Write a structure and sequence with these properties.
- The structure is a homodimer.
- Chain A is built from 14 helices and two strands, in the order αααααββααααααααα.
- Chain A is mainly alpha-helical.
- Chain A is globular and about 65 Å long.
- In chain A, strands 1-2 form a two-stranded antiparallel sheet.
- The first copy, chain A, folds into two domains: 142 residues, Farnesyl Diphosphate Synthase, CATH 1.10.600; 188 residues, Orthogonal Bundle (Farnesyl Diphosphate Synthase).
- The interface between A and B is large, with 46 and 45 residues.
Chain lengths: 337, 337
C-alpha cells in the first residue's frame, strides 16, 4: 500500500496547487465587484471536497496518454480538466442544496444559508457553471477535441437533470411512493443522476484529451464504468444503513435495501414498510432496520458483493480497443474498501 | 406599414411552425417519463412569448446572408437558432421566477407555482438549458461556426449571471440602497442582465451563421446594439411609471427615473426619495411621482428621446465592415413606437 499512499499524497498535492491560478485567470471592467464575488464563491464551494472525479480525470489521463506526451504542459491540462469536472459537480451540489434544504456540507454551512444569498444561491450556481465553460474555452479552444469536450459537459448536464426528475417522482405526498421502488427505477436514477458524471465523464474526457474519439472505444469504457458506478452506489446504500459511524430511511430515499426488501417481503412485511419508511422517528427507523435484518439483507448483500466483484473482474479482462485493464482494475479495487 | 405588417405576420407563422419539430426531435430509453416531462415543460414555457429575440435572429440572418444562400434549408436553420435563443431566455425567466417569487407570467401561472414543482422548478430550468444545447448539437455540429455558437451561448450565460449579482447589491435588507443608484451602475445592470442577450446575441449568431467571425465586424455591431439595448430599457422604465394602461417604485428598482431624480434632487428632495422609494403604499408611490413631475422628468426624457435618436441614427450611418444599415435602422425604429 506504500507506493499508492505516496503517489496519491503528491498527485492530490500537484492538483490542489493548480486551483489558485484557475481563480486568478477568471479575475484579470464595468462590474469589478462581480469578479471579486466569483473569487469568494469559487474558494468556498469548489476546492474543499474529497476531489474524487477531478483526481479520477488526471489519474485516467496518465494511464491513457502516450509516454512521449506526458509533458508538464499536458499534465497541467489534464489537471485543469479535473477542476472543470469539480466545478460541474459543485454546480450540481449547490442546485440540490437549495432544492433539498441542506443546512451543512463539507463540514461548513451551505452557501445558500448565508443571509445575503438565500434563493439568490441559484444565480451563484449559474456563475460557477459559467466559470467552468469560460475556463474550458481559455485552456482548450485551440485543441481539436474541443467540440467533444463541450458536447460531453452538455450531455452530462442533460443526464443529471433527467436523473433528478425521475428521483422526485419517488416522493408523492412528502411520503415515499413505494410502488415505484423497483430495481429498473433505482438502476436508472443511479445511472443518470450519479454514474454518468462520477465514473464515465472523467475517463471519456481523459480519452478525448488523448485524441481518442473512437465511438466503440467510448461505449466499451462506459459499459464497464456504469456497472462500477452502480456497485459504488449499492455499497454506499449498505453503509448508510449498516454503517459503522446516514439518514436514508427517515428520508424515504430510493435505496438498494428498500428495493430488495420489497422484492422479498410478505404482504405483512410490505405493510410495516408503508407505515415506517421515510418517517423521522427513532422508532420507525429502528423498525425498518429490524425488518432489514429479518429479510436477511446483510447476508444477501455480502453474497451480491463477492459475486458482482468477480463478474466485473471477468468483464474488465474482456475489454479491448487498446484500453489499459490496470485502469478499470484500479477503479474496481478502490471502490471496494 | 402594411408590407411590414404582412411579412411580419407570415415570418411569425413560419417560426411558430418549426417549434413542434424541435420538441418531437428531443422525444424520439431507460427513463421514457423524463422525455414526456421535457415535452410538457417546453410546451408551457418556451413558445408562448412575444418571441422578439428568436424573431430578431431570423430577421438578421435574412438581412446578413447572401441571396444565393437564402435556401429553405438555411432558413430552417436560422429558424431553429431563433428557438435556441428563446430557450436561453426561458431558462433566464424561470430561474428569475423562483428567485423573485413571480406568481403569473405570459397570462398563466409561473411553472414553479404548480404543486408538483415548487423548488424543483430549478431542475426543470436545467432541463430546458440542456434541450437548448442538445438542439444546438443536432442541427449545427457539422458547421465550421459550431464552436463559436456554443461559446456565444456560454459567454451570454456568464454575462446574465454577473448582471443578476450586480442587481441584487441594489436591494440591501428589503430597502433600496440609494447610495448605489448611479448611471454607471444602472448602465452596467442593463448591459449585463438584458442588452447582451436581448440585442447582441441574435445578431452575432446570425453573423456567425453567415460565416462572418471577423472580431472587428462583431465589435461595431455590438457597440450600436448595446446602446439601443440601454435606450429600450430607459423607455421601458418611463412607461412603467408614466405608461398608459408599473410596480417599479413600490419595488425600489434601479430605474433611469430614480437615478436621474437623485442627480437633480435638492438634499430635501433626496429625503422624500429615502422615505418613499421601495414602500408598497398608494401615498409613498404617489409622492415619488409628485417629485418626478416636480423635477421635470417627463420633459428631460422627451429631450433625451429626441436627442438619443439622432445620435444613434448618425452612429448607424458611420458603420462599415459590409454590415447592412437597413438592419440597425429597423431595430432602432421598432424600439421607438
Amino acid at each position: 500500500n506504500l507506493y499508492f499512499q505516496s503517489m496519491s499524497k503528491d498527485q492530490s498535492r500537484e492538483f490542489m496547487a493548480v486551483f489558485p491560478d484557475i481563480v486568478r485567470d477568471l479575475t484579470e471592467i464595468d462590474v469589478p465587484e462581480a469578479s471579486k464575488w466569483l473569487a469568494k464563491l469559487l474558494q468556498y464551494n469548489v476546492p474543499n471536497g474529497k476531489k474524487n472525479r477531478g483526481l479520477a480525470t488526471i489519474l485516467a489521463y496518465k494511464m491513457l496518454e502516450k509516454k512521449e506526451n506526458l509533458t508538464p504542459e499536458n499534465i497541467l491540462l489534464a489537471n485543469v480538466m479535473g477542476w472543470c469536472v469539480e466545478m460541474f459537480h459543485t454546480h450540481q451540489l449547490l442546485l440540490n442544496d437549495i432544492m433539498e434544504g441542506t443546512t451543512m456540507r463539507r463540514g461548513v454551512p451551505c452557501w445558500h444559508r448565508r443571509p445575503d444569498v438565500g434563493l439568490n444561491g441559484i444565480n451563484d450556481a449559474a456563475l460557477i457553471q459559467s466559470a467552468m465553460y469560460t475556463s474550458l474555452k481559455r485552456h482548450f479552444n485551440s485543441k481539436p477535441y474541443y467540440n467533444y469536450v463541450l458536447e460531453t459537459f452538455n450531455e452530462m448536464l442533460m443526464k443529471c437533470s433527467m436523473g433528478h426528475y425521475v428521483q422526485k417522482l419517488m416522493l408523492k405526498t412528502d411520503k415515499p411512493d413505494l410502488s415505484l421502488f423497483t430495481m429498473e427505477k433505482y438502476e436508472a436514477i443511479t445511472k443518470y443522476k450519479t454514474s454518468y458524471y462520477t465514473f464515465q465523464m472523467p475517463v471519456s474526457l481523459a480519452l478525448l484529451m488523448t485524441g481518442v474519439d473512437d465511438p466503440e472505444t467510448h461505449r466499451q469504457a462506459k459499459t464497464i464504468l456504469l456497472k462500477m458506478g452502480e456497485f459504488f452506489q449499492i455499497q454506499d446504500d449498505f453503509l448508510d444503513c449498516f454503517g459503522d459511524p446516514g439518514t436514508d430511511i427517515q428520508d424515504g430515499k430510493c435505496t438498494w435495501l428498500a428495493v430488495v426488501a420489497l422484492q422479498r417481503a410478505t404482504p405483512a412485511q410490505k405493510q410495516i414498510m408503508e407505515d415506517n419508511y421515510g418517517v423521522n422517528k427513532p422508532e420507525a427507523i429502528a423498525r425498518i432496520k429490524d425488518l432489514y435484518e429479518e429479510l436477511q439483507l446483510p447476508h444477501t448483500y455480502s453474497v451480491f458483493e463477492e459475486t458482482t466483484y468477480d463478474l466485473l473482474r471477468t468483464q474488465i479482462q474482456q475489454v479491448t480497443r487498446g484500453l489499459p485493464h490496470e485502469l478499470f482494475f484500479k477503479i474496481l479495487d478502490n471502490i471496494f474498501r
